[PDB]
């Protein structure tokens, strides 16, 4: 289990085409994605037997 | 390469490449042979491995691989084996660009087995060559818009 | 036993066989398993030396 | 298993004599000898049952 929480339209000069499967999904969105990003991880743990 | 160079204030992404291989067969790293009959449910029975020197490169553990699909499938058959199952040493999800499909090689075991597969004895994989992240001088001038 | 090579020893025993033979040979002592749990460690070491 | 690779006769002013053993080996040869050379370790190694 991970997160990475990301800007939109951030450092991305205007006229930039983001990357997308037939689906239409963004699969590379615009700017840094990721470059510069939260990385949440480690949802949460308790003690096992 | 020289040093005289002017700081650029603003500068920010324009274009994105992305290169991607799709299949992932589940590869399956066991120390135990699964060609040799497993022991009946109260009696177990392990033969450990043969050395498959593959790449060069030898070792005792024996690789399998197989479809996304199949492995739950083979799984579930398995349950019945705790002790085999238990001696599974590593899983790596490899893409299947790299492996020949003529280098794998069906194997049979006392039960009946979907796609379980296994690599040959000496084999070589594909090399991953790289198409779209190809771009040549002329691109790059444009891009700068400076043609 | 100790094979004290290289003026060094220890209880360790080494063996060597070329890449064709070790999978025959792995194949062969298949029937043991406890033998085969007991290997240690396995290093391709060059001919030359 | 380990190599350790280095240059001779660098860093080493003329007349330098090597010590030997009265095998005629050179012990210690001239300069640097293993100060500034490379160290190839880990030859190989395979997963063990």
Known sequence: ????????????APNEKPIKASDNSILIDTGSFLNTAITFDSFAEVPIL | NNDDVIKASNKYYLNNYLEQFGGNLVLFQSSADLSKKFGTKKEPNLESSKGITYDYITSPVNLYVMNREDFNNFMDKM???????????????????????????????????????????????????????????????????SN
Not at chain 2, 103 to 119: H, P, R, S
């Open chain 2, 79 to 145: 349950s019945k084996y705790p002790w085999i199952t238990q001696n599974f040493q590593k899983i790596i999800l490899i893409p299947a660009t790299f492996i020949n499909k003529d280098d794998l090689e069906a194997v049979k075991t006392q039960e009946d087995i979907k796609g379980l597969m296994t690599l040959k004895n000496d084999k070589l994989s594909n090399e991953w060559e790289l198409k779209e992240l190809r771009v040549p001088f002329e691109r790059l001038q444009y891009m700068l818009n």
């Open chain 1, 1 to 12: 289990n991970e997160v990475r929480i990301y800007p939109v339209d951030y450092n991305s």
